[PDB]
Amino acid sequence: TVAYIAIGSNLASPLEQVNAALKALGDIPESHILTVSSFYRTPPLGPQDQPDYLNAAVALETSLAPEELLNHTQRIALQQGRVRKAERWGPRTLDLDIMLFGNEVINTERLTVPHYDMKNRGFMLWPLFEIAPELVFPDGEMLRQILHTRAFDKLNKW
Ligand SMILES: [Cl-]
Numbered sequence: 670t671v672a673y674i675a676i677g678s679n680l681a682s683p684l685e686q687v688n689a690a691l692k693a694l695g696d697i698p699e700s701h702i703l704t705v706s707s708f709y710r711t712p713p714l715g716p717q718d719q720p721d722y723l724n725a726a727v728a729l730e731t732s733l734a735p736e737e738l739l740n741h742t743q744r745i746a747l748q749q750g751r752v753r754k755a756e757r758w759g760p761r762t763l764d765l766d767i768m769l770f771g772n773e774v775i776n777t778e779r780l781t782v783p784h785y786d787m788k789n790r791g792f793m794l795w796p797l798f799e800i801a802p803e804l805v806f807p808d809g810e811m812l813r814q815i816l817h818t819r820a821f822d823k824l825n826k827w
Contacts, residue, residue, distance in 0.1 A: 670771040671703065672738060673801065674727045675784070675793050677711075677764040680751065683723035684708070684827070686763060691727065693745040694765075700731035700738070706796035708827035720761065723827050726768070726796035735770045739780050742767060768793060774807045783807065791821025 674694065678686040687708065695702045706726040713719035731738055742765040746752075750763040768784045775782040783806060787793045794816060797804065804812040 670731055672729045672731055672735075672767055672771070673769040673797060674729055674742065675764065675766045675768050675787075675796070676725045676727060677722050677792065678762065679713070679720040679722040680761045680763055683720070686749070687723050687725060689749055690745060690763060690765060691725075693749060694727060694729060694742075697729070697731070697733070697738070697741045697745075699733050700729055700741075703728040703730050704800050706799045709792060709796055710825050710827045711792045711822070722792070724792040724796055724824075726793065726800055728800055735767070735773065735775055735782060736777075736780055738770070739767060766793075768797065769804075769806070772807050788815055788819070791824050794821070795824050 676687055676690050678690070680686045691702070691705060709724040711722040711724055713721065733741070746763055746765045751761065755761065766784050767780070767782055768787050770782045773782060784793070794812065798812055798816060802813060806812070
């Protein structure tokens with residue numbers, strides 16, 4: 670099954686943080702990276718001197734069940750994030766989210782797929798469109814149309 674995963678980081682030097690997450694994704698059991706988007710840049714909100722977020726989308730082929738894949742993405746987030754050194758929240762973070770899982774709709778306390786807010790996040794949609802321009806959501810919406818009809822912040826490549 671093809672799952673689409675969002676990666677985001679504003680940790681340390683984000684380029685290598687994201688490369689580490691990618692390596693970890695490829696090391697998930699029964700799973701293989703099919704393609705990775707370009708790396709995109711999201712500025713922080715407000716005047717503060719805060720680091721930019723690096724965003725990417727990954728197509729991962731997997732024979733894992735959705736909640737099994739979630740165990741792994743949560744594990745990698747913990748292991749690679751500075752959760753132990755810093756705090757769960759941030760403000761500096763490594764985010765790994767399952768955006769889509771095949772054509773499945775999952776509504777559980779642990780897992781909601783499609784990701785609940787992805788259709789409002791240009792930093793998820795633009796990278797996803799780069800790697801899956803013909804994508805159609807489970808509810809029938811075409812990714813290509815959402816990008817024509819919703820307002821998103823300008824998103825430059827990293
Ligand atoms: Cl949907």
